Amino acid sequence: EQRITLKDYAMRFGQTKTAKDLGVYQSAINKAIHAGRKIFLTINADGSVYAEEVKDGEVKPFPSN
DNA sequence: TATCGATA
DNA sequence: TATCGATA
């Protein structure tokens, strides 16, 4: 309700909805999950999402380009 | 299935 | 200096 894993968020709202929200390509996602990357998403009260993957010690964004 | 441009 | 998402 304020901070979740991708996969989870996935399970809830489906890869499609997710994708759009992140603003990346659907495939981008399942692949991501398929690769099991620690990404988390936050939920701005205004229902706005955002992600960030915990790379190596460092926490980078998502996506990165 | 692999490159390439953007990023940080 | 290297990753990752998009493409074709």
Curated annotation (Swiss-Prot):
GO terms for biological process: latency-replication decision; negative regulation of transcription by competitive promoter binding; negative regulation of viral transcription; release from viral latency; response to UV. Residues 15-34 bind DNA. The keyword Transcription applies. The keyword tRNA processing does not apply. GO terms for molecular function: core promoter sequence-specific DNA binding; DNA binding; protein homodimerization activity. It comes from the Viruses. Keywords: DNA-binding, Early protein, Latency-replication decision, Repressor, Transcription, Transcription regulation, Viral latency, Viral latency initiation and maintenance. InterPro entries: Cro-like, Cro_sf, Lambda_DNA-bd_dom_sf. Changing A32W: Loss of dimerization. Pfam families: Cro. Plays an essential role in the switch from lysogenic to lytic state and in fine-tuning the lytic phase activation. Mediates the de-repression of the lytic promoters from repression by cI at an early stage of prophage induction. Turns down the expression of the transcriptional activator cII, a factor that initiates the expression of repressor cI, the major component promoting latency. Additionally, cro is able to directly bind to the promoter region of cI thereby preventing the transcription of cI repressor. Binds DNA as a homodimer. This is Regulatory protein cro.
